């Protein structure tokens, strides 16, 4: 895993010694080279995972997340170079360094075999994200959003540290392979109940769970575009990955202890979806859609069946790609019209036809159109939850309506109808925005051809 | 003050602390404590302001009461043991008296009331000297007598110090009072782990000393005493704002910075003894310390408060302050996590 | 740092170099009293350094290459705009007054440093003890508001207590009629826009609040317009004075060492000029200050320290 | 009411005015064209196409098809000796010591 950490940490001299006019070109070129290099993690075996040393390993669950992260960094570099065009050079280099540090922390978080190292860099991912949100956010409410995000995460995740140190003192090790071969059942006691709660609540907050999701429609809105990409495409999936890793040790208490939380998502993904029917804000609409999809992921993890696990992996990857693309489209509209409200700019298909095509395709992939991997993940979670209980299909099917009921709604008021008369600064679409949309979307449709590389470690 | 006299007084402070550290007799511990108090009194009176006189008077009265209680404990242990060797005490009453005496000396709650007072009324260098150097000798005396320390009393003092320090630092605007309440919370952290593993107490003491030295050196370099001048610092020099943001990030225990190193290690020595409620409660309370550190970083570096017209004149002059060991203390306090097992040199 | 505690320890006492001619003499008067040349006349009788009156670009002459910087970097104010528009809505009057007070403070610090370091006497014009006589003359004419006076009083109270008053203060008495005659005589076009009531208020606050204020802290000498034309009489008067008043008598070597350490730190001198009081006349917003500071860094010889600028031709940077 | 000194908000810049052939990456035309070429070359023709070729020719991912071949052995054994096609026990019940009760 040293072959990816070292070039990522050498990206900082690359971005700090470059000229004032070629930082973007050099950083995008070398991050695309690292994304190409990332494909050597597909050497997965049907029985054994890929173990590199005592410190790092990568099974078939971490590999799609690593490839997605190192593919996502150049996309952020291309997106965040227009609202920072007038910025000072030193602050531009500091922003690029924050992005590089965030990628380095993420790609060594996804590969740590030891759990306290995973916790340490899982919380080291807080600092660059928070700095980006509270520094390069636009309006006044970025400070409150940063406070909410940081304090929800830390107040949920300090008992996780306490529980992990207790595990290290009790079992004797925190290596994931040793814990895979030394796992003991957890009996029925109040101590084990709070053990389960301390292990679960950090990832509950970072998923987010309904009722603990109040930091999402702030931090996903006040942040800049690259902050929106990392907020919607990696960190939520990082919480899901941690949940998948740590649910191994919490058997068989989970078989009843997951009983409330499933309801807190099974109803929750209804309510937040209904919020998208009556949202006056485009970015808030995308954030609440992310809440609903990740609640579906929560249910899939908590019922702990194989089909649900592969559905959760495919759903996480597909939702990350789709949410990043939707945030890019909303940011392009916000750059053109200088307001975030959805009803201000209407009828943009008459002026911007190809961006309307990208909008249509992104909305179609949002509402789980087959044979996309969004539909594959949603379908597999549906099969597993039907095996769990029958009436759950109702809670699925109604959601299958409401999702489309906002997605096409998001397609209409932003693209269809009569255009706004007084808005006359609708410039034609740049090559950069179209290239960003294509680089977001074409990997998703190509992954629809060969989905078996994202179907989890038990495929 | 003459430079020679100031140097002699500073070496007298150092000699008093060293005398407390290296002696094996209780009378010499008392002698070193009086040496330290008597020699540190004029440093607080460096400017000859009414506030400095009142701060020195309050410090004198608190230290006098603490020293008298310490002598009472020494005399009781003399009566009930017939010896003066600095080791475990042979009476619970003498142990209790000595523990509250050293708690009054360290500023532990509910004897903390002088710490935000006194630090406000004295200059920045003298406040740094107080909050870092004056805490070495009582911690050594607490280290030597831990076989006789009551667990209930020391843990009550630790949790009271942490809670009161967080809730006190939540309110202030002045930087010196913020550092005082942060000091109170940090000594609650250091005394909470003393009876389990004193090596972690030494490690937390060293890390706290480095962080307080870095923050006070930054404040002296920028000549800032309130939060609004610290906000103004962004126009004069941005690198100073970056440094104070990173140092305040590290002071809150945010990983991967070095401030995560002590407290986490403390948890590792309290879940071994099957004490789970107390470290979780202490981390939950230290979130408030993180909150007012976050408020300071919001005011200083993450935004830009408005400046004045005369600040342009300050653009024409380079700084000439002897920022001694500022880069070394900034590096050592923030990137020391990957060398965590080096704490084994303190065992 | 060439001076500090170590030089004081080894024997560089400031009382060894202070002679009987090491006096701080400040020459005052109205805006056209003809005091200027008179101070220079004193400067060519006792061998004293003559500091000209501190304007907007005094600090620009002290540092850098000595050239005056553009007005958007230094001051952000105009004297001619104040003369033409004394009641401007952008607060140019109080902004200029505060900048002039800061320049006078810097000049007083430089004068004190030169006097305490070389032992040579210094002649100044309109020191910080005689700047408020303009400020009230603004406020009594309705040019500025009361909060400007409150901010000026706060800044002066927190920054004037750390210095010493001059040994001799010289005042030139010229009526406002002859002042306006001189103003018409010189012919600076913006200067006829001044009013006679402004000069009358300047004279009133000179006589009623200033000379009684430092009658006791220094020796006061008052001259009219035709006694000032004879410099020999003036230097005869200042050479026959018995200095037994003020705080200059009880000055030990330690006190002058502390004062010299204070005046040599220019950022410490101007520490309390930019106090965080938000008045609309002096408060500059974040974006404007950021843009102006970024422009200031791009000037030649201004990005780095005074010896680390390669664009002006400094060598051996890698060994410094 | 008198207010503080502040620059007014600058007007929104259009990149198509000073450069009608702009790709939207930078104001400098040569830097614009080179950034577009770098993005289009290393994104589409280096990572996307070669990555699809790499994933399409992965060497027997997760041993999957190998198991199919092994099944084509095992049934061929177990249909030739009259053995049951699948046993109901994963391990040999002889070598398992059940607790007595």
């Amino acid at each position: 895993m040293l072959k990816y950490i070292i070039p990522t940490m050498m990206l900082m001299p690359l971005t700090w010694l470059s000229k004032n006019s070629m930082i973007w070109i050099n950083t995008t070129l070398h991050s695309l080279l690292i994304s190409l290099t990332s494909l050597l993690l597909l050497n997965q075996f049907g029985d054994n995972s890929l173990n590199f040393s005592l410190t790092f390993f990568s099974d078939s669950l971490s590999t799609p997340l690593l490839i997605l992260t190192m593919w996502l960094l150049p996309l952020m570099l291309m997106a965040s170079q227009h609202h920072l065009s007038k910025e000072n050079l030193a602050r531009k280099k500091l922003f690029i360094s924050m992005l590089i540090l965030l990628q380095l922390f993420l790609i060594m978080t996804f590969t740590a075999t030891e759990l306290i190292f995973f916790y340490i860099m899982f919380e080291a991912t807080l600092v660059p994200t928070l700095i980006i949100i509270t520094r390069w956010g636009n309006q006044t409410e970025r400070l409150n959003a940063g406070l909410y995000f940081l304090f929800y995460t830390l107040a949920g995740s300090l008992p996780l540290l306490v529980a992990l140190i207790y595990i290290q003192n009790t079992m004797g090790s925190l290596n994931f392979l040793i814990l895979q071969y030394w796992v003991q059942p957890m009996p029925n006691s109040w101590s084990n109940t709070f053990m389960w709660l301390a292990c679960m609540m950090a990832f509950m907050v970072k998923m987010p769970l309904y009722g603990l999701h109040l930091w999402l429609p702030k931090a996903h809105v006040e942040a800049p575009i690259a902050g929106s990409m990392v907020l919607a495409a990696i960190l939520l999936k990082l919480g899901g990955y941690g949940m998948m890793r740590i649910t191994l040790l919490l058997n068989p208490i989970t078989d009843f202890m997951a009983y409330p939380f499933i309801m807190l998502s099974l109803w929750g993904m209804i309510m937040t979806s209904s919020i998208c029917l009556r949202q006056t804000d485009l970015k808030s609409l995308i954030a609440y859609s992310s809440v609903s999809h990740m609640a579906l992921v929560i249910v899939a993890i908590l019922i702990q069946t194989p089909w649900s696990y592969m559905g959760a992996t495919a759903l996480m990857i597909a939702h990350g790609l789709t949410s990043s693309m939707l945030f890019c489209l909303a940011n392009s509209n916000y750059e053109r019209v200088h307001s975030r409200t959805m009803i201000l700019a209407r009828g943009l298909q008459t002026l911007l036809p190809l961006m309307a095509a990208w909008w249509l395709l992104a909305s179609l992939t949002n509402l789980a159109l087959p044979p996309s991997i969004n539909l594959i993940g949603e379908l597999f979670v549906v099969m597993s939850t039907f095996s769990w209980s029958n009436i759950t299909i109702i809670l699925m099917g109604l959601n299958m309506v409401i999702t489309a009921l906002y997605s096409l709604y998001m397609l209409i008021t932003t693209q269809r109808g009569k255009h706004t008369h007084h808005i006359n600064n609708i410039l034609p679409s740049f090559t950069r925005e179209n290239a960003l949309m294509s680089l977001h979307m074409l990997p998703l449709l190509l992954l629809s051809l060969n989905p078996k590389i994202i179907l989890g470690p038990l495929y | 003050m003459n430079p020679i006299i100031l140097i002699i007084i500073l070496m007298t402070v150092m000699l008093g602390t060293i005398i407390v550290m290296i002696s094996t007799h209780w009378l010499l511990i008392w002698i070193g404590f009086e040496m330290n108090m008597l020699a540190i009194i004029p440093i607080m009176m460096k400017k000859h302001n009414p506030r400095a006189t009142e701060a020195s008077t309050k410090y004198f009265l608190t230290q006098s009461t603490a020293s008298m209680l310490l002598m009472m404990a020494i005399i009781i242990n003399l009566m009930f043991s017939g010896q003066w060797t600095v080791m475990k005490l042979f009476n619970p009453m003498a142990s209790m008296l000595m523990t509250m005496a050293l708690a009054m000396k360290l500023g532990m709650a509910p004897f903390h009331f002088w710490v935000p007072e006194v630090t406000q009324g004295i200059p920045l260098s003298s406040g740094l000297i107080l909050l870092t150097w004056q805490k070495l000798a009582p911690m050594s005396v607490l280290y030597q007598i831990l076989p006789s320390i009551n667990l209930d009393l020391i843990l009550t003092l630790s949790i009271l110090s942490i809670t009161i320090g967080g809730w006190g630092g939540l309110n202030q605007t002045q930087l010196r009072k913020i550092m005082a309440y942060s000091s109170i919370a940090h000594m609650g952290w250091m005394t909470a782990v003393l009876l389990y593993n004193p090596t972690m107490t030494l490690l937390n003491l060293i890390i706290y000393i480095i962080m307080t030295s870095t923050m006070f050196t930054l404040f002296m370099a920028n000549s800032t005493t309130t939060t609004l001048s610290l906000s103004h610092t962004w126009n004069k020099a941005p690198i100073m704002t970056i440094l104070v943001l990173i140092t305040l990030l590290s002071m809150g225990g945010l990983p991967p910075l070095s401030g995560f190193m002590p407290k986490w290690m403390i948890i590792q020595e309290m879940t071994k003894n099957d004490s789970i409620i107390l470290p979780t409660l202490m981390a939950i309370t230290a979130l408030l310390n993180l909150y007012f550190y976050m408020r300071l970083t919001y005011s200083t570096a993450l935004t830009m408060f408005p400046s004045t017209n005369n600040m342009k004149m300050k653009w024409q002059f380079p700084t000439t302050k002897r920022m001694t060991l500022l880069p070394t203390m900034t590096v050592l306090s923030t990137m020391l996590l990957p060398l965590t097992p080096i704490l084994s040199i303190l065992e | 740092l060439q001076y500090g505690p170590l030089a004081y320890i080894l024997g560089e006492k400031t009382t060894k170099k202070m002679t009987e001619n090491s006096k701080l003499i400040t020459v005052d008067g109205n805006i056209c009293s003809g005091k200027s040349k008179l101070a220079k006349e004193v400067a060519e009788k006792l061998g004293l350094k003559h500091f000209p009156e501190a304007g907007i670009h005094y600090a620009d002459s002290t540092t850098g290459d000595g050239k005056p910087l553009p007005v958007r970097f230094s001051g952000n104010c105009s004297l001619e705009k104040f003369y033409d528009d004394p009641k401007s809505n952008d607060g140019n009057s109080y902004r200029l007054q505060a900048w002039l007070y800061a320049s006078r403070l810097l000049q007083y610090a430089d004068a004190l440093e030169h006097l305490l370091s070389t032992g040579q006497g210094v002649v100044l014009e309109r020191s910080i003890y005689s700047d408020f006589v303009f400020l009230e003359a603004m406020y009594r004419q309705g040019f500025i508001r009361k909060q400007c006076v409150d901010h000026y009083n706060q800044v002066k109270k927190v920054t004037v207590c750390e210095y010493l008053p001059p040994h001799v203060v010289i005042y030139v008495d010229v009526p406002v009629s002859e002042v306006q005659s001189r103003i018409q005589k010189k012919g600076n076009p913006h200067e006829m826009k001044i009013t006679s009531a402004y000069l009358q208020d300047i004279e009133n606050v000179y006589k009623g609040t200033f000379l009684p204020e430092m009658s006791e802290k220094c020796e006061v000498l008052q001259y009219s317009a035709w006694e000032a034309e004879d410099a020999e009489k003036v230097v005869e008067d200042i050479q026959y004075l018995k200095y037994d008043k003020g705080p200059w008598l009880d000055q030990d070597d330690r006190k002058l060492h502390n004062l010299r350490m204070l005046v040599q730190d220019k950022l410490e001198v101007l520490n309390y000029t930019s106090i965080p009081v938000f008045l609309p006349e002096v408060t500059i917003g974040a974006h404007q200050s950021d843009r102006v500071f970024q422009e200031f860094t791009e000037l030649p010889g201004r990005k780095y320290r005074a010896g680390y600028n390669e664009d002006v031709g400094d060598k051996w940077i890698w060994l410094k | 009411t008198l207010r503080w000194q502040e620059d007014p908000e600058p007007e929104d810049e259009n990149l198509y005015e000073k450069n009608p052939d702009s790709h939207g990456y930078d104001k400098d035309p040569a830097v614009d064209v080179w950034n577009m070429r770098v993005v289009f070359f290393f994104g589409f023709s280096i990572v996307l196409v070669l990555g699809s070729t790499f994933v399409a020719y992965l060497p027997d991912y997760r041993m999957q098809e190998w198991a199919r071949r092994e099944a084509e052995r095992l049934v061929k054994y177990r249909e030739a000796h009259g053995l049951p096609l699948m046993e109901s026990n994963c391990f040999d019940p002889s070598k398992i010591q059940l607790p007595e009760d």
Binding site: - | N171 | F278 | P10
Partner: peptide
């Protein structure tokens, strides 16, 4: 349009005697 930065009243509510 541009990034919001703290104005006079924000700095005043952050710069009193107590929070």
């Amino acid at each position: 349009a541009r990034q919001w930065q703290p104005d006079v009243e924000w700095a005043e509510q952050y710069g009193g005697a107590v929070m």
